[PDB]
Amino acid sequence: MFEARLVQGSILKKVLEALKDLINEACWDISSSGVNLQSMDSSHVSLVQLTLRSEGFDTYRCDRNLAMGVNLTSMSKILKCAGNEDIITLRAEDDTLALVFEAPNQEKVSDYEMKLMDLDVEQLGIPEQEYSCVVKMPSGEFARICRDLSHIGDAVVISCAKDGVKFSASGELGNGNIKLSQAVTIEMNEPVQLTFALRYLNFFTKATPLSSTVTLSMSADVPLVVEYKIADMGHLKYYLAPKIE
Amino acid sequence: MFEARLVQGSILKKVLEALKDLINEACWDISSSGVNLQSMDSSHVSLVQLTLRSEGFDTYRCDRNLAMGVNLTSMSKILKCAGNEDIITLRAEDDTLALVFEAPNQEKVSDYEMKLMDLDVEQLGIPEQEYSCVVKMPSGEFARICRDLSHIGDAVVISCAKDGVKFSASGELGNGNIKLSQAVTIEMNEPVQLTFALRYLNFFTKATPLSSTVTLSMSADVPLVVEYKIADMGHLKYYLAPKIE
Amino acid sequence: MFEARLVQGSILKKVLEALKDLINEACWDISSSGVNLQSMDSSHVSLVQLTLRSEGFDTYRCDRNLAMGVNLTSMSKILKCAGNEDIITLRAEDDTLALVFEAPNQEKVSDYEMKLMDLDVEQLGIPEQEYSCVVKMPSGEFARICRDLSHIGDAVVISCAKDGVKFSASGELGNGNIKLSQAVTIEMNEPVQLTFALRYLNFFTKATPLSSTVTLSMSADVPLVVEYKIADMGHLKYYLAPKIE
Amino acid sequence: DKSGMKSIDTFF
Amino acid sequence: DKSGMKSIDTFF
Amino acid sequence: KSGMKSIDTFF
């Protein structure tokens, strides 16, 4: 028997809006430690990693470890039925997932039973390594940058140095250059210059409501890490394969 | 000569936005008592009944009783030309309908002449009967319920009992259940369980800006009544044929 | 070397949104006096005239007079990358146009290089003549009028007299009449009645955020002038050929 | 949809 | 529409 | 101009 109560229903609503546009089906791994999700996209080019620590939930119980095959689109539709102030309860047994929406400002109780599915997908393991550059900046600033450069080109050249960070794009209309100065903080070991598809970055930036800040971890010839810390509850990480150069 | 002045122009704007999506052409019956409209939809499955009592208008004159065939889409376009604060005047003679928009915050006067049409449609009479269940609830709550369950299924099973009321839907993603407890008030005689198409309920909920509350009248094997009281001026009632079960 | 700094970046953003929907390519004439633009539309029926006086810019330098062939759509996309509070710098040399966005509320510097093009278009000269009627009114009122009458018909009959001004339209649904009284001011010499395509008037009204007021200059058998004064910096004028009557 | 509807005329 | 327009060039 | 290597190539 699994039962997790989250007072901040919005968190789960936002988490699902951040995922649904990148992945349609993902396996939700439940354990005594908390909720874990690790899935790669349809184009096999980006990877999502969600971690919601049990300590982040008001109530958390997990008798047996579950691996629920969820259709993120269906779960999103269900979560859209939850009010922005609702207390969300997740309850599952070792066939379906039950979502209960307790409304604070009313005597209304919503109870949804979502059909699960069997997911035979590619499981990939990410070793936590050290990056040559780690940029921490306002999530909104980042989302604006990615959206802006999208009007100029398809790829973004992220150049990270001691001074600041630079994002550039080129297209048929001309070229663009956004230079940020060191709140923006840089934990650089070696300077890095990497090229990434803006298409994918703009899917990642859908996690913007989750955090006031975003962190970009870069090391040469390795995927980018765009992390959104949830609220001491956990995080949501997006990995993006760099462009062959 | 017919002339009705309404200080709250918004009422008429809102009334027309509540109708246009359900019916395209309806006959506006004018009499010394007030404005009456009774039309069934294109699918012959739902019925609209509008009543605007003469006492609700600042000025009301009706020499001869009129039955004006109006294209609700055209009338809506005309009403869209009226500001949210405007005083609307309706004036007709026993060929066209004249709408005059007196702007309060300016020396602007709008005058529109809408072409009428001859409507040979099916006239249906509704006997005011007594229902096994009468639910009064916030119109917004209802509109949210209907929108939410639409994500789950096509039909809604409204179960009304002494405790509260329950709305349920089922679909390919799973099933949903919204349970309301007794502001929500229930004037139940017998418990009722009826099935209705959400498609039509979502057209009715377009009348939400007209009232802070909504009332649902249910009796077994008879159409549902969703009533929106205007402002002691009258009401707007929507009848929906139940699903064959 | 050309360099013009504008503290109010919004002005340029707004100017470009006001132009892009009417013209796709226009030549930007730069001189010691300021920025000038004069282009007719694709349908050869309306003309735009932009004037931004050098005195309106915080910094203005123009060594040699430039005539830059700009794709207004591309320039608009670039300007969309500028924040509503940004200080915009334009810099060009006698190949490309450089736009620099200095963000006030952050340590962000955006630098865009827009490719120019060679424009062999029809150059037309407008002699500043005297009009039989000059209407000054709130730009919003005008934009609402044009939008409203669009729902009724395709053309607008502007009747200007001593009392006030009248805008009328006719269509398949009926006819509309908007009567304004003498803030609305009329500098009439002779009464005028002219017919204009609302399609074009609705493109002109896209300049609404530039000014709280608008002025309409009319003389019989000559094009209409819809002027939006920028901010002692200059103006944006739209000429519309009258309808053959 | 499993169930269909009767016309509103059947009731009125 | 009933009426057409003359080119803006005809005036300028 | 540039393509990408699959995320699997890194993991």
Side-chain angles (χ1 to χ4, degrees), chain A residues 1-63 65-84 86-93 96-104 109-112 114-129 131-161 164-186 188-220 222-245, chain B residues 1-63 65-84 86-93 96-104 109-122 124-129 131-161 164-186 188-220 222-245, chain C residues 1-63 65-93 96-104 109-129 131-161 164-186 188-220 222-245, chain D residues 3-5 7-12, chain E residues 3-5 7-12, chain F residues 2-4 6-11:
Chain A
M1 190 260 188
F2 160 64
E3 180 166 80
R5 173 167 275 98
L6 185 44
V7 202
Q8 272 264 77
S10 67
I11 288 172
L12 205 48
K13 297 168 56 59
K14 298 187 194 208
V15 160
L16 214 40
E17 286 296 298
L19 286 165
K20 72 159 195 194
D21 295 295
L22 198 57
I23 50 171
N24 321 308
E25 282 113 51
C27 171
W28 292 67
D29 297 292
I30 317 301
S31 63
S32 317
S33 54
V35 181
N36 297 295
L37 187 149
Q38 190 165 248
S39 179
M40 83 192 298
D41 82 304
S42 28
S43 287
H44 297 249
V45 124
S46 67
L47 196 143
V48 225
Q49 202 285 293
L50 172 68
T51 298
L52 297 175
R53 288 170 256 137
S54 58
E55 298 74 38
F57 300 83
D58 162 59
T59 283
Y60 195 86
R61 167 175 176 162
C62 176
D63 300 343
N65 281 197
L66 296 161
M68 310 175 288
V70 168
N71 175 312
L72 298 191
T73 302
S74 305
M75 201 190 164
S76 199
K77 285 185 185 173
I78 285 184
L79 283 180
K80 288 293 211 77
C81 306
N84 311 277
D86 288 5
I87 300 109
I88 302 176
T89 315
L90 302 176
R91 185 166 54 246
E93 319 291 305
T96 75
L97 172 59
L99 300 93
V100 179
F101 310 144
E102 299 192 336
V109 166
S110 284
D111 189 353
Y112 297 84
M114 176 177 70
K115 295 169 103 174
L116 299 173
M117 55 190 58
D118 269 314
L119 282 170
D120 302 344
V121 212
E122 194 175 4
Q123 292 228 272
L124 308 164
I126 300 160
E128 190 236 52
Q129 64 155 84
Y131 301 83
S132 291
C133 283
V134 177
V135 186
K136 175 227 148 209
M137 68 165 88
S139 55
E141 187 142 53
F142 186 62
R144 190 77 149 89
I145 293 163
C146 294
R147 200 154 72 251
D148 290 359
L149 298 175
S150 290
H151 302 338
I152 320 295
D154 299 329
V156 59
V157 184
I158 314 165
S159 300
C160 201
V165 61
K166 189 161 76 75
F167 303 88
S168 325
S170 298
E172 277 172 333
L173 48 80
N175 62 282
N177 207 27
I178 312 161
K179 179 67 186 184
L180 294 186
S181 304
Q182 273 215 105
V184 177
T185 53
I186 307 167
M188 176 212 126
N189 293 311
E190 311 168 42
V192 202
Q193 196 178 99
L194 293 151
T195 301
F196 302 108
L198 285 144
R199 186 176 119 79
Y200 297 82
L201 291 178
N202 284 314
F203 285 129
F204 303 175
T205 61
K206 289 180 191 167
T208 296
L210 282 163
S211 177
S212 60
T213 57
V214 63
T215 79
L216 318 165
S217 296
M218 291 167 282
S219 249
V222 317
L224 169 68
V225 201
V226 183
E227 177 177 26
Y228 290 84
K229 304 276 194 181
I230 294 165
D232 294 303
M233 178 155 196
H235 61 254
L236 183 55
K237 288 185 191 172
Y238 296 95
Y239 296 80
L240 183 54
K243 239 128 145 71
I244 294 158
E245 305 237 297
Chain B
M1 190 260 188
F2 160 65
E3 180 166 79
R5 174 167 275 98
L6 185 44
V7 202
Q8 272 264 78
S10 67
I11 289 172
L12 206 48
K13 298 169 55 59
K14 297 187 196 205
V15 159
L16 214 40
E17 285 296 298
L19 286 164
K20 72 159 196 194
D21 296 294
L22 198 56
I23 49 171
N24 320 309
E25 282 113 51
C27 171
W28 292 68
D29 297 292
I30 317 302
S31 63
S32 317
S33 54
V35 181
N36 297 294
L37 188 148
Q38 190 165 248
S39 180
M40 82 192 299
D41 82 304
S42 29
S43 287
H44 297 250
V45 124
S46 66
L47 197 144
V48 226
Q49 203 284 294
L50 171 68
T51 298
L52 296 175
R53 288 169 257 138
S54 57
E55 297 75 37
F57 300 83
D58 161 59
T59 283
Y60 195 86
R61 167 174 176 162
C62 175
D63 300 343
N65 281 197
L66 296 160
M68 310 174 288
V70 168
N71 175 312
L72 298 191
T73 302
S74 306
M75 201 191 163
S76 200
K77 284 186 185 177
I78 285 183
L79 284 181
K80 288 294 210 81
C81 306
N84 311 277
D86 288 5
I87 300 109
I88 302 175
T89 315
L90 302 174
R91 186 165 54 246
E93 320 290 305
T96 75
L97 173 59
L99 299 95
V100 179
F101 310 144
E102 298 192 48
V109 166
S110 284
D111 189 352
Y112 297 84
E113 227 122 60
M114 177 177 70
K115 295 165 95 182
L116 299 173
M117 54 192 58
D118 267 313
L119 281 169
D120 301 345
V121 213
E122 195 174 4
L124 308 164
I126 300 159
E128 187 235 58
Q129 64 155 83
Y131 301 84
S132 291
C133 283
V134 177
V135 185
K136 175 228 148 207
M137 67 165 89
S139 56
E141 187 142 53
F142 185 63
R144 190 77 150 90
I145 292 161
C146 295
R147 200 154 72 251
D148 291 359
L149 299 175
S150 290
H151 301 338
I152 321 295
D154 300 328
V156 60
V157 183
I158 314 164
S159 300
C160 202
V165 62
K166 190 160 77 74
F167 303 88
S168 324
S170 299
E172 280 169 340
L173 47 80
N175 63 281
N177 209 27
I178 311 159
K179 180 68 186 184
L180 294 186
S181 305
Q182 273 215 104
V184 177
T185 54
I186 308 166
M188 177 211 124
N189 293 310
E190 311 168 43
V192 202
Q193 197 177 99
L194 293 152
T195 302
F196 303 107
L198 285 143
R199 187 176 118 80
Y200 297 81
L201 291 179
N202 284 315
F203 286 130
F204 303 175
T205 62
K206 289 179 193 167
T208 296
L210 282 162
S211 177
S212 60
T213 57
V214 63
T215 80
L216 319 165
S217 296
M218 290 167 283
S219 250
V222 318
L224 168 69
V225 202
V226 182
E227 177 177 27
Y228 290 85
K229 304 276 194 183
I230 294 164
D232 294 303
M233 177 156 197
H235 60 254
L236 184 55
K237 287 186 192 171
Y238 296 95
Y239 296 81
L240 184 54
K243 238 127 145 72
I244 293 158
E245 305 238 297
Chain C
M1 190 260 188
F2 160 65
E3 180 166 80
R5 174 167 275 98
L6 185 44
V7 201
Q8 272 264 78
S10 67
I11 288 172
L12 205 48
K13 298 169 55 60
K14 296 187 197 206
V15 159
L16 214 41
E17 285 296 298
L19 286 164
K20 72 159 196 195
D21 295 294
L22 198 57
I23 49 171
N24 320 308
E25 282 113 51
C27 171
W28 291 68
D29 298 292
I30 317 302
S31 63
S32 317
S33 55
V35 181
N36 297 295
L37 188 148
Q38 190 165 248
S39 179
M40 84 192 297
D41 82 304
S42 28
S43 287
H44 297 249
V45 124
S46 66
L47 197 144
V48 225
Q49 203 285 293
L50 171 68
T51 299
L52 297 175
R53 288 170 257 137
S54 57
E55 297 75 38
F57 300 83
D58 161 59
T59 283
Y60 195 86
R61 167 175 175 162
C62 175
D63 300 343
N65 281 198
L66 296 160
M68 310 174 289
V70 168
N71 175 311
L72 298 191
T73 303
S74 306
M75 201 190 163
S76 200
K77 285 186 184 177
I78 285 183
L79 284 181
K80 289 293 211 78
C81 306
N84 310 277
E85 307 288 2
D86 287 5
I87 301 107
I88 302 175
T89 316
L90 302 174
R91 186 165 54 245
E93 320 290 306
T96 75
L97 173 59
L99 299 95
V100 180
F101 310 144
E102 299 191 48
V109 166
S110 284
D111 189 353
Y112 297 84
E113 193 99 274
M114 177 176 70
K115 295 160 93 187
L116 299 173
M117 55 191 58
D118 267 313
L119 281 170
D120 301 345
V121 213
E122 194 175 4
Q123 292 232 279
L124 308 164
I126 300 159
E128 186 235 58
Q129 64 155 84
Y131 301 84
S132 291
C133 283
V134 177
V135 185
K136 175 228 148 207
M137 67 165 89
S139 56
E141 187 142 52
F142 185 63
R144 190 77 149 90
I145 292 162
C146 295
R147 200 154 72 251
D148 290 359
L149 299 175
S150 291
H151 302 339
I152 320 295
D154 301 329
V156 60
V157 183
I158 314 164
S159 300
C160 202
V165 62
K166 190 161 77 74
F167 303 89
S168 325
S170 299
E172 280 169 346
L173 47 80
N175 63 281
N177 208 28
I178 312 159
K179 180 68 186 184
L180 294 187
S181 304
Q182 273 215 104
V184 177
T185 53
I186 308 167
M188 177 211 123
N189 293 310
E190 310 168 43
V192 202
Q193 197 177 98
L194 293 152
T195 302
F196 303 107
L198 286 143
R199 186 177 119 79
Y200 297 82
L201 291 179
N202 284 316
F203 286 130
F204 303 175
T205 62
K206 289 179 192 167
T208 296
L210 282 162
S211 178
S212 61
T213 57
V214 63
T215 80
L216 319 165
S217 296
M218 290 167 283
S219 250
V222 317
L224 168 69
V225 202
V226 182
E227 177 177 27
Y228 290 85
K229 304 276 194 183
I230 294 164
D232 295 305
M233 178 155 196
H235 60 254
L236 183 55
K237 287 186 192 170
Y238 296 95
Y239 296 81
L240 184 55
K243 239 127 145 72
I244 293 158
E245 305 237 297
Chain D
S3 282
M5 283 168 153
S7 280
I8 203 127
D9 318 281
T10 321
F11 305 100
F12 313 120
Chain E
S3 283
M5 284 167 153
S7 280
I8 203 127
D9 318 281
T10 321
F11 305 100
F12 313 120
Chain F
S2 282
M4 284 166 152
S6 280
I7 203 127
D8 318 281
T9 321
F10 305 100
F11 313 120

mmCIF file of all heavy atoms in Angstrom, chain A residues 42-62:
data_model
loop_
_atom_site.group_PDB
_atom_site.id
_atom_site.type_symbol
_atom_site.label_atom_id
_atom_site.label_comp_id
_atom_site.label_asym_id
_atom_site.label_seq_id
_atom_site.Cartn_x
_atom_site.Cartn_y
_atom_site.Cartn_z
ATOM 1 N N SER A 42 11.208 10.847 -26.963
ATOM 2 C CA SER A 42 10.902 10.152 -28.226
ATOM 3 C C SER A 42 12.022 10.231 -29.255
ATOM 4 O O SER A 42 12.189 9.288 -30.032
ATOM 5 C CB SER A 42 9.600 10.685 -28.824
ATOM 6 O OG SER A 42 9.335 12.035 -28.464
ATOM 7 N N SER A 43 12.786 11.350 -29.259
ATOM 8 C CA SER A 43 13.914 11.581 -30.161
ATOM 9 C C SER A 43 15.253 11.071 -29.634
ATOM 10 O O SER A 43 16.264 11.224 -30.325
ATOM 11 C CB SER A 43 14.007 13.042 -30.567
ATOM 12 O OG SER A 43 12.977 13.391 -31.477
ATOM 13 N N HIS A 44 15.257 10.454 -28.424
ATOM 14 C CA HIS A 44 16.422 9.836 -27.783
ATOM 15 C C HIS A 44 17.584 10.798 -27.692
ATOM 16 O O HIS A 44 18.725 10.426 -27.969
ATOM 17 C CB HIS A 44 16.853 8.600 -28.581
ATOM 18 C CG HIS A 44 15.829 7.526 -28.614
ATOM 19 N ND1 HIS A 44 16.023 6.342 -27.956
ATOM 20 C CD2 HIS A 44 14.621 7.501 -29.220
ATOM 21 C CE1 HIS A 44 14.939 5.630 -28.185
ATOM 22 N NE2 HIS A 44 14.062 6.292 -28.930
ATOM 23 N N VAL A 45 17.291 12.042 -27.338
ATOM 24 C CA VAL A 45 18.265 13.124 -27.336
ATOM 25 C C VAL A 45 18.354 13.875 -25.987
ATOM 26 O O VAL A 45 19.400 14.443 -25.655
ATOM 27 C CB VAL A 45 17.960 13.987 -28.592
ATOM 28 C CG1 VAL A 45 17.694 15.464 -28.301
ATOM 29 C CG2 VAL A 45 19.019 13.782 -29.678
ATOM 30 N N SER A 46 17.270 13.822 -25.199
ATOM 31 C CA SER A 46 17.195 14.427 -23.875
ATOM 32 C C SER A 46 16.681 13.413 -22.863
ATOM 33 O O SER A 46 15.996 12.457 -23.242
ATOM 34 C CB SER A 46 16.296 15.657 -23.896
ATOM 35 O OG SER A 46 14.952 15.298 -24.147
ATOM 36 N N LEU A 47 17.009 13.629 -21.585
ATOM 37 C CA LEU A 47 16.584 12.772 -20.490
ATOM 38 C C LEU A 47 16.035 13.607 -19.329
ATOM 39 O O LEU A 47 16.617 14.637 -18.978
ATOM 40 C CB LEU A 47 17.762 11.893 -20.010
ATOM 41 C CG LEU A 47 17.381 10.681 -19.146
ATOM 42 C CD1 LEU A 47 18.247 9.480 -19.435
ATOM 43 C CD2 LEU A 47 17.421 11.019 -17.678
ATOM 44 N N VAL A 48 14.909 13.150 -18.733
ATOM 45 C CA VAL A 48 14.297 13.778 -17.549
ATOM 46 C C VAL A 48 14.542 12.923 -16.310
ATOM 47 O O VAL A 48 14.403 11.698 -16.355
ATOM 48 C CB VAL A 48 12.789 14.105 -17.628
ATOM 49 C CG1 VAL A 48 12.530 15.502 -17.103
ATOM 50 C CG2 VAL A 48 12.214 13.913 -19.026
ATOM 51 N N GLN A 49 14.842 13.580 -15.189
ATOM 52 C CA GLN A 49 15.029 12.897 -13.936
ATOM 53 C C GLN A 49 14.291 13.688 -12.857
ATOM 54 O O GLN A 49 14.635 14.839 -12.568
ATOM 55 C CB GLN A 49 16.521 12.722 -13.646
ATOM 56 C CG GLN A 49 16.832 11.607 -12.666
ATOM 57 C CD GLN A 49 16.496 11.998 -11.255
ATOM 58 O OE1 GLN A 49 17.120 12.887 -10.664
ATOM 59 N NE2 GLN A 49 15.456 11.386 -10.715
ATOM 60 N N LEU A 50 13.233 13.094 -12.307
ATOM 61 C CA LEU A 50 12.453 13.714 -11.235
ATOM 62 C C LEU A 50 12.732 12.999 -9.918
ATOM 63 O O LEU A 50 12.800 11.772 -9.892
ATOM 64 C CB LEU A 50 10.945 13.667 -11.556
ATOM 65 C CG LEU A 50 9.963 14.094 -10.452
ATOM 66 C CD1 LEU A 50 10.058 15.595 -10.146
ATOM 67 C CD2 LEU A 50 8.566 13.726 -10.829
ATOM 68 N N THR A 51 12.890 13.774 -8.840
ATOM 69 C CA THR A 51 13.082 13.258 -7.495
ATOM 70 C C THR A 51 12.229 14.053 -6.532
ATOM 71 O O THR A 51 12.417 15.260 -6.388
ATOM 72 C CB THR A 51 14.557 13.247 -7.078
ATOM 73 O OG1 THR A 51 15.274 12.391 -7.956
ATOM 74 C CG2 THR A 51 14.753 12.738 -5.659
ATOM 75 N N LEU A 52 11.281 13.378 -5.887
ATOM 76 C CA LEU A 52 10.435 13.972 -4.864
ATOM 77 C C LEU A 52 10.691 13.172 -3.587
ATOM 78 O O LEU A 52 10.237 12.032 -3.482
ATOM 79 C CB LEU A 52 8.948 13.932 -5.267
ATOM 80 C CG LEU A 52 8.519 14.722 -6.507
ATOM 81 C CD1 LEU A 52 7.057 14.482 -6.820
ATOM 82 C CD2 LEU A 52 8.765 16.212 -6.337
ATOM 83 N N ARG A 53 11.499 13.722 -2.668
ATOM 84 C CA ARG A 53 11.840 13.054 -1.409
ATOM 85 C C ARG A 53 10.621 12.928 -0.516
ATOM 86 O O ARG A 53 9.844 13.882 -0.398
ATOM 87 C CB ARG A 53 12.984 13.771 -0.667
ATOM 88 C CG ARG A 53 14.347 13.594 -1.344
ATOM 89 C CD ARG A 53 15.414 14.489 -0.738
ATOM 90 N NE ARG A 53 15.715 15.631 -1.606
ATOM 91 C CZ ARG A 53 15.885 16.872 -1.172
ATOM 92 N NH1 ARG A 53 15.807 17.144 0.125
ATOM 93 N NH2 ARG A 53 16.143 17.852 -2.028
ATOM 94 N N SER A 54 10.453 11.739 0.102
ATOM 95 C CA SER A 54 9.341 11.417 0.999
ATOM 96 C C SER A 54 9.159 12.470 2.084
ATOM 97 O O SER A 54 8.028 12.779 2.464
ATOM 98 C CB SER A 54 9.545 10.046 1.627
ATOM 99 O OG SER A 54 10.769 9.967 2.338
ATOM 100 N N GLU A 55 10.277 13.063 2.537
ATOM 101 C CA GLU A 55 10.329 14.104 3.564
ATOM 102 C C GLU A 55 9.609 15.368 3.100
ATOM 103 O O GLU A 55 9.238 16.203 3.927
ATOM 104 C CB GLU A 55 11.786 14.415 3.952
ATOM 105 C CG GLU A 55 12.547 13.248 4.569
ATOM 106 C CD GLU A 55 12.982 12.147 3.621
ATOM 107 O OE1 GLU A 55 13.382 12.462 2.477
ATOM 108 O OE2 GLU A 55 12.916 10.962 4.021
ATOM 109 N N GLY A 56 9.402 15.486 1.794
ATOM 110 C CA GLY A 56 8.704 16.617 1.201
ATOM 111 C C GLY A 56 7.193 16.502 1.267
ATOM 112 O O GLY A 56 6.488 17.486 1.017
ATOM 113 N N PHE A 57 6.683 15.310 1.592
ATOM 114 C CA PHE A 57 5.250 15.069 1.679
ATOM 115 C C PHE A 57 4.795 15.118 3.125
ATOM 116 O O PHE A 57 5.539 14.692 4.011
ATOM 117 C CB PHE A 57 4.899 13.699 1.089
ATOM 118 C CG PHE A 57 5.258 13.500 -0.360
ATOM 119 C CD1 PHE A 57 6.544 13.139 -0.731
ATOM 120 C CD2 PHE A 57 4.298 13.631 -1.350
ATOM 121 C CE1 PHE A 57 6.874 12.948 -2.072
ATOM 122 C CE2 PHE A 57 4.625 13.438 -2.698
ATOM 123 C CZ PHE A 57 5.908 13.092 -3.048
ATOM 124 N N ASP A 58 3.565 15.601 3.365
ATOM 125 C CA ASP A 58 2.985 15.647 4.704
ATOM 126 C C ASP A 58 2.813 14.217 5.225
ATOM 127 O O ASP A 58 3.129 13.935 6.385
ATOM 128 C CB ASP A 58 1.630 16.368 4.689
ATOM 129 C CG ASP A 58 0.770 16.077 5.912
ATOM 130 O OD1 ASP A 58 1.227 16.369 7.050
ATOM 131 O OD2 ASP A 58 -0.340 15.521 5.739
ATOM 132 N N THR A 59 2.310 13.331 4.361
ATOM 133 C CA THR A 59 2.112 11.924 4.674
ATOM 134 C C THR A 59 2.783 11.114 3.589
ATOM 135 O O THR A 59 2.658 11.439 2.416
ATOM 136 C CB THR A 59 0.620 11.620 4.868
ATOM 137 O OG1 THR A 59 0.245 12.093 6.157
ATOM 138 C CG2 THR A 59 0.284 10.134 4.759
ATOM 139 N N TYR A 60 3.531 10.091 3.988
ATOM 140 C CA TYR A 60 4.206 9.209 3.058
ATOM 141 C C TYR A 60 4.313 7.819 3.630
ATOM 142 O O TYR A 60 4.874 7.629 4.703
ATOM 143 C CB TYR A 60 5.581 9.748 2.633
ATOM 144 C CG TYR A 60 6.134 9.035 1.418
ATOM 145 C CD1 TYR A 60 5.796 9.441 0.131
ATOM 146 C CD2 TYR A 60 6.958 7.922 1.557
ATOM 147 C CE1 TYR A 60 6.278 8.770 -0.989
ATOM 148 C CE2 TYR A 60 7.445 7.242 0.442
ATOM 149 C CZ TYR A 60 7.105 7.672 -0.828
ATOM 150 O OH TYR A 60 7.585 7.010 -1.927
ATOM 151 N N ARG A 61 3.760 6.852 2.907
ATOM 152 C CA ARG A 61 3.764 5.437 3.245
ATOM 153 C C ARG A 61 4.010 4.630 1.969
ATOM 154 O O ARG A 61 3.398 4.903 0.936
ATOM 155 C CB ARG A 61 2.434 5.042 3.897
ATOM 156 C CG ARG A 61 2.233 3.540 4.001
ATOM 157 C CD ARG A 61 0.983 3.160 4.757
ATOM 158 N NE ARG A 61 0.788 1.710 4.733
ATOM 159 C CZ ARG A 61 0.001 1.036 5.570
ATOM 160 N NH1 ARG A 61 -0.663 1.671 6.529
ATOM 161 N NH2 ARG A 61 -0.117 -0.281 5.462
ATOM 162 N N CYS A 62 4.913 3.657 2.036
ATOM 163 C CA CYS A 62 5.222 2.792 0.910
ATOM 164 C C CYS A 62 5.645 1.435 1.440
ATOM 165 O O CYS A 62 6.807 1.237 1.800
ATOM 166 C CB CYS A 62 6.288 3.410 0.006
ATOM 167 S SG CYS A 62 6.828 2.344 -1.358
#
